[PDB]
Design a binder for this molecule. Sequence first.
Ligand code: ZN
Lengths: 1032, 38
Amino acid sequence: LKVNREIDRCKRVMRERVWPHIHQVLAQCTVGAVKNPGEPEMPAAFITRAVSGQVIFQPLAVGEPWGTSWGTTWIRVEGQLPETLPEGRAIELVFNLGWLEWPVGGHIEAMAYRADGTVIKALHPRNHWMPLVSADGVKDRVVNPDGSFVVYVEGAYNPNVPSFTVTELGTKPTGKADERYEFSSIDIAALDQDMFDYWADLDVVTGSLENMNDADPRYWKLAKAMQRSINLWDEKDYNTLALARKALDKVMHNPANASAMTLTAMGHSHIDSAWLWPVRETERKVGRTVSNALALMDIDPDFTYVMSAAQHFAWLEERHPDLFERVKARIAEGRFIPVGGMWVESDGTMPCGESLIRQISYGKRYFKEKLGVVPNGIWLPDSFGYTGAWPQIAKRSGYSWFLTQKLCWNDTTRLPHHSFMWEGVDGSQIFTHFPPADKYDSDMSANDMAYVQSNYKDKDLSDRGILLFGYGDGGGGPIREMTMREHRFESFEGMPKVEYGTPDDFFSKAETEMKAEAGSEMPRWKGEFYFELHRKTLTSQQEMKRGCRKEESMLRTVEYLGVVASLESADYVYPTERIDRIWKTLLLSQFHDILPGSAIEWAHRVAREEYARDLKALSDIARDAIAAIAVANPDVARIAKARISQFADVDPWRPASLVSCGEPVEVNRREDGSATLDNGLLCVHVAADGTVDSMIDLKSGREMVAKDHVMGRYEILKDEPGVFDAWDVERDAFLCATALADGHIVSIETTADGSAVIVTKNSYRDDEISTTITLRPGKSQLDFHADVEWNVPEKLLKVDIPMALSASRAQYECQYGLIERPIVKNTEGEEAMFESCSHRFVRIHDSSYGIGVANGSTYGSDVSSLRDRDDALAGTMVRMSLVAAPTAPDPRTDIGHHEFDWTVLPCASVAPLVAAAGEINAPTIENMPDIAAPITLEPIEGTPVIDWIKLADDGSGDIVARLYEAAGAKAKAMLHVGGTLDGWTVRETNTLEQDESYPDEPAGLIGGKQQAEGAELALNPFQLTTLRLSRA
Amino acid sequence: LKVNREIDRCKRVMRERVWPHIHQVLAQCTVGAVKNPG
Ligand SMILES: [Zn+2]
């Protein structure tokens, strides 16, 4: 059609006949540079060293790469600012350092400083210009009395790292220029605002023709004015410009339709704290983005910008002190908004409950003392699913709403609604919203308006949405082209109304109006947000998953010992600052890019050796605190190899030992190679090739292994996905798995305590798996411990546990509580859940029985039914993923020597499973005097569990316990305290240890603040309460 | 749909897992050149 061919003419007119005549080049500047391929130094220490004499600045070469990979080049620019400058026009430098266009935050960047150490503005691929004079006769401070000036530019020659492709770029500074980026004559230019407005109008108009339909007369009244204008603009006669704009004005002022939506736009750039670059680079990225944000708050007023991740604010505070005081000046104004008080945008499903609570707490604490703000909602646009315990934690932490967008990438199903009420397992509900643009980084195009209005899933009762724009995922922020195409879409009949705003006000009014409109028809979602994509993120880099749990499972012990030692010994200083530093370092390695393990080899290498260092430092605070208890109770008892595991079967926080102390375990070797372990409580029969093939529960007398199957068979899948190698698993892999039928028992023995051990070996073509199966006296559980020497890439290992019990749903655990997922997947959407998360245990049960499996560091599994060889129902298979080896961002990921531990239990109720999980995840310590816990609850009914006894953060000396219910039934208990804190009071708080109550949340205590000894507790299913004990 | 996403996997298999293993490199050759812009 004629119009579609007229759109191409208009776009080419924009690109060649209008765009170049915006920056009129006046003069070019002399340049000299100094290169450095090493690690960068602080800019302030370089400038003052670069002002006196101590740098030479050998001139650059036009047409050659100005740096090396992962290096820094400092450039001294000197211009002249000649006279006869155009009147009423702005003057600005233009830096064209060989930019590409596709990745904004990916390849090279830069930052321009003044000759005192102060930032001017950052330089990015699509935003490369620096204001000298502002079209009003006022100059920047870096201008002499004459036209002389001098600028320093720190340029980062970051390589462009492909997402999924084998490369050597994400390892270390190479010292070579792999991708060539030229220099090409930094220059000075005058800006023409009228041509720039004309280009903006053309852009707005021509982008609306691709998205309208040829049925409204506006499609034709537009395409006529677009044609009349470009037929009138002759770039060789400037006086025609004023004629061309008047033609493209009879259509720019048309009031929006009556029923059009209303969008609240705010500037937002998402910065992945570590992904495709080292963590030593994110600091500069935050600096650049923030500087860009403030240089756009003087192009126009009423422009708003949001920023999350208090850790980014801290990084900014240390590197650019001057750029911090400019932010605070905008915060008090109201145009700069910090949102979602959290340390970093953590992962949404893997961290435990205490991780999330501590993230919220540290974030709220930083946002208070520094910026003085109190956020009202959780900002989490990018995450691989959400745990389902989030609503309760958010509501009990003072929050009011919630924000997500990542759940659009699901491979099978689309969620029904965009704005809805999300109810967790407890019952508390939070208002949640997805930005209808289906992405956080928009460019404020006409395509995005058309999509937002034509995709919004609740247009019948909401007509209100949010809209984020800016260049994200690597920084950069929004560009001044986006802001000046927003004023065109303010009314613009044919498209949604758009206006600036803050998130809190949008959320308040949107929720209240949707409520008062819908009635008791408000959309609702109960449960978790299962992410139907990126299944391999549960096991991508195993040393990160093992590190997140081992460090956090022992922070519990270290913090508990600080409580016990601060009550026994009269002089013992609890090291608050070391613990705070360790906690912040931990919360930084739970970002949504490094816990899933989908970053470059460099990032994981640094994050891995941090776990080693903080693990070591933690087990010195422990032994130094235990030394204090050892002198306070000098003659009670001391045991080596103790494990303080919360919620045991008899004594909750007593430090139990490793010596089992039962009667020996009789072992009956058979002649064919098989063996028979038999303690008082189990009768295990191990076959000739590992693989326990029958397990009797001698108490009840039930087989525990599904017939014609063996427990412990190893499979190795062949996973070579289409895209996102380190991210997701094909379903095809589940078809290709091959068992390792070869194998044998290496050794059968008994030990000093009386337990029996069996040592097995297994191999697949290069690598070796040696398992140790243990049976201890007086414990109704079987323990497995495997050591892997993984060497072959592109493979995936997992073990299976065939259970002799058949049910319709499987039971996992959440951060606080439990969930169930189907076993046999019926519909198309259910088959998308073929692999799922599991914190610390999975249970398959029925009305009166059940079998459970608890793990140490795995985090991943999948369940399916089992059918006998005569085709009758046999049981259920539970497979849990151990280690995978991708190749995309990390060529040499997960090579060599992984450990794994797990255990299998017969459990009618859920209490012994929780006890076994807690007891397998606890760290070991030495020379620990065994003394009763200070806080104890006697269970009158149900199963309440005290999780995280710890000290107060106010330094006052109070105790804070975080107790919940872990069975799904109401629980009644009462508190008993030891003889070291009698006379103390107890009271109820929120998760942040503050006296704040909420009318829509039940409480634990009955009454108010009363005596601790004898206070009673009632807990409705999956409730999370926090007790605070004070001396008075 | 599942098939359209299975086409991408097959095309990438062609491009990376099948195509490079066609020309097995044995040895490289010494080279010398003379240039002429006329
Ligand atoms: Zn992200």
